[PDB]
Amino acid sequence: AVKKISQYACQRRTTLNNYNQLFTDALDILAENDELRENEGSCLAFMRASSVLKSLPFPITSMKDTEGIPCLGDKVKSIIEGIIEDGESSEAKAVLNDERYKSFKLFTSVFGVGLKTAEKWFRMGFRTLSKIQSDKSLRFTQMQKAGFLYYEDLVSCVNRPEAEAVSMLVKEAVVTFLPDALVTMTGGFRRGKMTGHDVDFLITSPEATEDEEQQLLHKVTDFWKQQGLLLYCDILESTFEKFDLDHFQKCALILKLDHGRVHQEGKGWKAIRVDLVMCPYDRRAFALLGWTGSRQFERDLRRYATHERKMMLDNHALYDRTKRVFLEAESEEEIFAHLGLDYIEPWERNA
DNA sequence: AAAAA
DNA sequence: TTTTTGG
DNA sequence: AAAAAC
Ligand SMILES: Nc1ccn([C@H]2CC[C@@H](COP(=O)(O)OP(=O)(O)OP(=O)(O)O)O2)c(=O)n1
Ligand SMILES: [Mg+2]
């Protein structure tokens, strides 16, 4: 007969071939509105419903189709019913016409602007980016200044040839200071995505000392600053503790990507958002798993570990509360096995 | 908002 | 019913 | 020291 679809993204295979985009585009909009209205509960319920539909191997064409699918309560089934009716969501249409929603989308599209700043600007009466940028009283963070200066490039999204060009630059800068270092692209591109808002990398070295591990991101970014390629840089020192804003040493960057490096109407360069993460060699599988994503896959991995296995998972470790021991892993497959989960390939984590 | 405690 | 929802 | 990144 059939198998039961789990409520956990970590127990589903989600590939990029989405047969239910009509439903998930509507659910993504309704979730985003609840995120903006700080209704965390309703937001998460629409995110989970969107996630589960993305895992289906077929399109929903009737309400009978939704039987046995978890994460679809009465409210969500009303939304699906409405889309089956006319091909549109009246609920999502009303959100798209809402002035608070339109302003939040527009303002947060700027690097450096999140929910609090977007809400502040809206309550001040600002509706356009032109009126924000030209205001003489407003004060902008260094992140927002970079967000406005490179807006058109950052708003456009990175493609695979650009991501590969960035990978080459990262690898050649990293091996200059740590020749045995392992550089892995993570993030959407590792999950098989054609585009992304940024390019993320995990860096680890089997030999390097603590001090060498600490200095790598500083050495690599100076090197780029010397070449005039570092457009923005923010290095966060590690808040990870060997024995919970807890993270590995990382940096949020904007790099100048010369067009010649990508395999010229305007300047032969594009501003690219790049994130680098340095982790100790023994925690490389936990970091890789945390940074591969998707965000929904990571949420559910942690939720499943806690509620179903009485385990605690994060980007640095896996702890078993019953056995009172930290579980160690040399690969992602070993983490899945510790959790009692079937291995989900990176391209199947697009939840 | 949905599911579990 | 109240609590949880990654943390 | 809230905020923005994960
Ligand atoms: N809230 C989040 C955000 C991210 N991550 C992990 C999973 C993905 C990874 C990347 O951060 P993003 O770059 O925003 O992820 P993305 O998957 O690469 O999507 P996009 O490529 O379009 O930015 O970090 C996480 O555990 N929790
Ligand atoms: Mg990314």
Ligand SMILES: [Mg+2]
């Ligand atoms: Mg990123």
Ligand code: NA
């Ligand atoms: Na932003």
